[PDB]
């Protein structure tokens, strides 16, 4: 697809909508929108493997990682396809998202269509944490809200 | 991939989980699950074009229909790719779904991944009505619940 969207919802107050736009086949993807109900500061932001909400955000599984690499930051070559780093919530709890990423795609093998976008309770340490979990989930913690990434008009 | 799922939710009490499975790339898609909170009787059941729930089920757009065909029943030669007919709710308001379809798919042009599954207010007349609306929506009316179809395996 050329456009996609994810409506983020969870068990708490965190909610928002994130838009995806890819004007060219396997070209860069623009990711923008807003998320509210967050705590001021950095919050993990990734595309998880499954667009399965049968058990809330937990059934989405791990970060989308078709190349079987370690967790990293979006600017790192060693990263999961779904690693979009962190979004920043303002003092009002609102995170206005404006990202551009060339690893994720809206078509092809790395397509995120039908998968899950998740916003986390804690900051993603981008794999630079002093522990084993850092290179797995960046220690982003609980999934505050999520939504299946669907095709948009 | 070979398995997908949709969690149906709406503004009312209608809720449900519908599973999709396609063993072979060009094999039939098995559709099964349950939907509760429905009024006893027939209720429209289709895959809509957009997996967008920004403004509720209304944002899903029309029936998934790539080449602009007319609406029909799942067994009709002329039908939209997303036309899965009706589900039947029992006296307790539960519709046990167990269908197999040859038109929808989990890959390619007919892929429903990233699109929206919807269950309607009224029965789908399978496009045999003496009016133009029948050839578009089967006159199924409003959308009671819907969910984006995501990759589950
Ligand atoms: Cu995540
Ligand atoms: Cu429909
Ligand atoms: Zn990761
Ligand atoms: Zn139709």
Curated annotation (Swiss-Prot), chains A, B:
Disulfide bonds join 57-146. Changing residue 54 to R: In ALS1; reduces tendency to form fibrillar aggregates. Changing residue 45 to C: In ALS1; slow progression. Its cofactor is Cu cation; Zn(2+). Changing residue 57 to S: Enhances formation of fibrillar aggregates in the absence of bound zinc. It comes from the Eukaryota. Belongs to the Cu-Zn superoxide dismutase family. This is Superoxide dismutase [Cu-Zn]. It comes from Homo sapiens.
